[PDB]
C-alpha cells in the first residue's frame, strides 16, 4: 500500500549505490529496486550486503517482479578510500548491467571526529578521499557513459552539516567531515553547468536521522579538561618568563588544591584549578586530581606538535587518579545535554527514520528540472549558521593596527608573488612589523621573494623558509630560529588547473581533470590550509588568514568552478575551527579572505580597478590578522572576529 | 500511466489553491486532486475556474473517482488582494469540506513592473496585499483549525526572485514582486518554529517556467531612453548655475543633433547626445529626437517627484517625432536579448512546464520531515547573487570620510532615539557635517530629539521635521528649506509588537498577531523604507542606508521572528534597488544595516558589549554612507558599494 505510489517510477533505470548495505544508502537501494531501478549495492561488509540484497529480493518477489536476482547485485569488499577498487567498482556495474544512469554518492564515514588541533594529517586525508574524492572519481568514470546515451544523474549525499549556499555551517570536532560534505554540494554547484544538458549533478542534505552514548559523553569531558589544562598552559607561557617544561612541572603531583593554593603558580593555572574544584563533582577524582595518563598524553602530543620543548617521558611518574574520574552522574547529565541538543534542533520535534528520507529521495529523482541543487529531504533545524560572501568592508580600527608593532609575521605561499611582496611591505614599512618570515615551498619561489624583497632581505626583516610538502617542519624552523607567530596569512603554494572538466560527447575523456588531479586539487587547496591551521593553532598563533585562489578577468571558466569548489568547501574549514577555537578559549583569530569571485563581470577591467582590487586584499588581511587589544575580545566581539569569509 | 505514481499519495486531504483557474496553481489543484485530495480552486474569472474545474472533473472520472462534483469545487470572483474576500473565501472552503490539510499560497500578480523611482507607492502596496499580506491571511485563519486536529500544511508559492538563505537575488524593475516573493519565503523560516510540531511551513521557489513580447522590448527601449536622459539632467544639474528647468529647456528643441553641438549645453547632455546619435538606427526618430509625449510626460514625474520646480506644461509644444521612434529591427533585437538572456540561464538548457513543476511539488508534499525550508522544484539557474548578513566590517576610508565636510545629512527615525543622538553627533562633531535634518514620525520623537541634541539645535546644526504618515512631503520641506541630501539614513518609526505569532491548540486564537497587525508590520518595517529609498534616489540624495528593526539579549522570543522576517524580505528590496540603480548610471548608494540578529546568544550582554555595538553600528553606517571620491565610482568598485547588507 505505501509502496502503491512509487512503483514504476524508475523502470528501465539502472541505478549504483554506494554504501548501500544500511543507512539512507540501503534505504535507496531498496526503494529505487521496488520503484523499478536495476541496482547495484556497495559496501565494505559481505554478510550485511548479502542480507540487504534478499530482504530488497524478497520484498520484489512480493511485488510481482520476476528473476529478482538480476535486478539486485552487490559489490562487496568495496573501500570507496581506494582508487583501485572504485575502478573495479565501475567495471563489475558496467558488466552486470551497462550504463549506469544513477550514480548515488552515499557511502560516507564519520572521519577523525576531534578538533583540529588533535587531527591526524593522514586521518584528514583519509576522510576526504572516503567522503569526497570518491565522488569525483566515480562521476569521472561514469559521466563520459551517461553523456554519449544522453541522460544520467549525479546525486551525492551530503549533510545538513555541509552548509548551504552563502552560508557555512560550523560542525566542531567534525572539520574533516563537514569540508567532505560542503565539497560534496560544491561540486554539484560548479559541476552543473558543465554536465547540463544531459547530466544532472544535485547534492542531498538530510539533517539528523533516527551504551556508547555515555562513552560518547564520558569522551567530551576528557576533551573538554584536556581543552581547559592546554589553554591555560598556552596562555601562561605567554606572559611567564618559566619555560612550557618547568609550567607542565606544576602538574606533576596532580593535585588541582595545590596548584590552586601555589602562590608562584601562575593565574591561568591557579584560576583554572579553582574551576575544577567549583565544577567539578565531590565523588569525582576529576575534582582533586588535574589528569589521568591518557589526557596527558594528548596534551603532550598537543604540546610537541606545537613545537613546546618537552622530555617524552615528562608524564611517566604522574599520580594515577582513582576511579571515577569522572562520576556516571556527570556522564549521564553529558549525555542527556548531548541526545537534548539534537532533539532541541527539530521544529517538528520528531526524529526523521532513514525510510522517510531516501522515500523523498527517491520521489526527488524523479523531478527533470534541477541541476546544482541541495534538495533537504529532512530539515526544519534551529542550527548556528555564518553567512559567506561579504563584500562591503574597511580597514581595522588603529588600536588593532597598533598590535602589529614589533610583531613577528608568518606570510605563506608561492604563486601569488604580487600579493606576498604587498603584504610583507605593508606589514614592515606601514606597520611595523619587527620581522617577516617568508615560507614557499620551492627554491625558486624562495629566490623569486628575496629578489622582490632584497632591500628588507638585506636590512634582516624579510626571511625566506623553502617548505617542500614539509610544511610543519618548516614552521617549527621557523619558531626555533625567528620566534613564534602573531599574524599569520596562508596563501595556496599552487596555482589552479587549467584541463577541461567535461569532455565532448564521442571523445574518450582523456584530458579532462582526472581523479588524481582532483586529489591534487584538494592537496594544494583544502588540505594545505588544514595543515597551516593545524600548525598554527597549536603553535600559539595571534590570528590566521585562510586565502583562496585568486581568479581575473582572464582565468578560464574551469578555473572559475574549480576556484568556486574551494572557496565554498574552504568556508566549511574555516567556520568550524573558529568556533572550535572560541568555544575552547583559544586565542587565535581564524578568517577567510576570498581572492575568487563568482563570476568574471565582477572582476577589475583595467589598472585603476586592479589597484582598487591590490589594496581591497590588503585591507582584508590587516582587518582579520591585527591583533584584538587587551579588553576588546568579549564573548560578544569574540564570535564576530572568528571563523569568517569576506570576498575581495 | 503518468498518474498511476500520483494516484492515492494525497487520500483524504483537503487542499485550498488560489489562483487555481491556470498556471502552476491550476496543475496543482489537478494533480493533489488526481492524487486524491478534495480540493478547492479559487481566482477571479469564473469562466477559467469552470473551464479547469470541467476538465479536472473529467479527468478524475476517467481514472476512476465517483462523485466528482464532491471532489472539486471553485471559488469564483476572489480577489487574495481584499481581506473580506479572504474571509469569504475561508467560510466557502470550511462550509463545502471542513478543515483545510493544505493551504497552498500560490495566488500571484506581477506587480508594478517599473523601476522603483516610477513605482506609484499605492502600487507597491497592492503588491505586498496580493502577493504576500494574502498569505499570511490565510494562514492565520486556516492554522487555529489546523493545530486544534493536530495536523497540517502551509505551502507559500515564492520564486527563485524571492531570493535563498543568506543570498538575495537583485530582480531589477520587479522591487515590489521580489520583495513579495522574499516575504513568502521568509513567512516560511521565521514561522516554522512557531507552528511545530504539528503543521508544516515551507515555500517552493521554481525558476522560469513555460506579440507582446516586441511590446515589452520597445517598453524596455522606451525605459532606457528615460534613464539616460533623466541621469544626465540630474547630474548636469549638480554642477550647473542652471536651475533643472532651464536645463530641460535645453531639450525642448528636441534635436540630438542641436543638443550635442551646443558649446554652452552642459557635459553630460552633449555626451548624452553623441551616444544618441552612435548607438542609435539611422532610420529611428530616436537618433534624432531625444523624446516622445510619453516618455516627456515619464521624465516630468520623475522630477517633480524628486522635488524640481517644472511647470506642469513644459512640453505642451514638444516636437512630436516621426514614427517609427525604436525601428522594428532594435524592437526585435531586443526582444532577442531577453529570450537569450532568460534560456541562457538554463543549466539544462530546457524551459521546464507547469505540469513538472506542480508534478514536483505534489511529491514534495507527501514529504512529513520538512519545515521551513524553501524547495527548488526547478533549478540550475546561472544568475546574480548578493550574499547578505556579513559581520565583519570596518571603517570607510579617510578620503570617504572627508567628503562628509560641509555635507547635509538626513535622518529619519523615532523609536531609536539613542542610534539617532549618536549619528547625528558622529556626523556634526567627528566628520563635520555642515547640518543634519532630523525627520521624525511625531511631535513627541521630536521634542524627545531636540532636547537629546539641544547643543547642535541651539547652534542651528540641528533641524526637526515631523513626518506623520507623509514621509515624502517632510522630504520636499527638507529640501527646499535646508537643500538636498548627501547621506541619509533611514531607520523604521516603530519598534516590532510583542503579540503571540501562534495560538494555544485549544484556543480561539484572539490575541495573535491578527491580519490587520501583519499588514501594519509590513507598512513600517517594509513600506517605510520603500517610499524613502524611492524619494531620496528621486531627490539626487547621495547615499542611504536602510536599517533594521533592533534586537537585543532581552527582546522577545517573537520579536527575534519579526525583525527576521523584515531582515530577509528587505534584503530582497536593498539587492534590487542597488543594482537598478547601478544599471541605469544613478550616482546613489544604497546599502542595508542591520539591526537585528538571527539568535539571542549572539546579541551583547552587558554595558562593555552594548558599547562595542553601538560603535559597530556608527561604523557600518559611515561605512556605506561616506560619499564615493571623483575617480573612485569604478565598475568594480561600483557594484561592491550598493545592493549590500551588513548585521551589526
Redesign the interface.
Known sequence: GWA??????HLGKVALITGGSAGIGGQIGRLLALSGARVMLAARDRHKLEQMQAMIQSELAEVGYTDVEDRVHIAPGCDVSSEAQLADLVERTLSAFGTVDYLINNAGIAGVEEMVIDMPVEGWRHTLFANLISNYSLMRKLAPLMKKQGSGYILNVSSYFGG????AIPYPNRADYAVSKAGQRAMAEVF??F???EI?INAIAPGPVEGLFARRARLILENKRLNELHAALIAAARTDERSMHELVELLLPNDVAALEQNPAAPTALRELARRFRSEGDPAASSSSALLNRSIAAKLLARLHNGGYVLPADIFANLPNPPDPFFTRAQIDREARKVRDGIMGM?????M?TEF??A??TV??L????????T????????Y??T???????????PERLAELVGSTVYLIGEHLTEHLNLLARAYLERYGARQVVMIVETETGAETMRRLLHDHVEAGRLMTIVAGDQIEAAIDQAITRYGRPGPVVCTPFRPLPTVPLVGRKDSDWSTVLSEAEFAELCEHQLTHHFRVARKIALSDGASLALVTPETTATSTTEQFALANFIKTTLHAFTATIGVESERTAQRILI?QVDLTR??RA?????P??RQ??LERFI?AVL??TAPLPP??D????G???RG?A?TV
Open positions: 502503491e505510489s512509487l512503483i514504476g517510477l548551504e549556499k552563502d552560508a552543473a553547468r554536465l547540463g544538458p544532472q527539530l521544529y517538528l520535534q520528531r526523521p522517510d528520507v522515500m523523498a520521489y526527488y524523479a523531478d527533470r528540472n534541477v541541476s546544482g541543487e534538495f533537504h529531504p529532512s530539515g526544519g533545524l534551529r548556528e549558521r553567512p559567506t560572501g561579504g563584500e562591503l568592508f574597511g580597514l581595522p580600527s578568517n563568482r563570476a565582477e572582476e577589475p577591467r583595467d585603476h580597478e582598487q582590487e585591507e582587518l582579520v579588553e576588546a568579549t564573548r560578544y566581539a564570535r564576530i572576529h569568517r569576506i
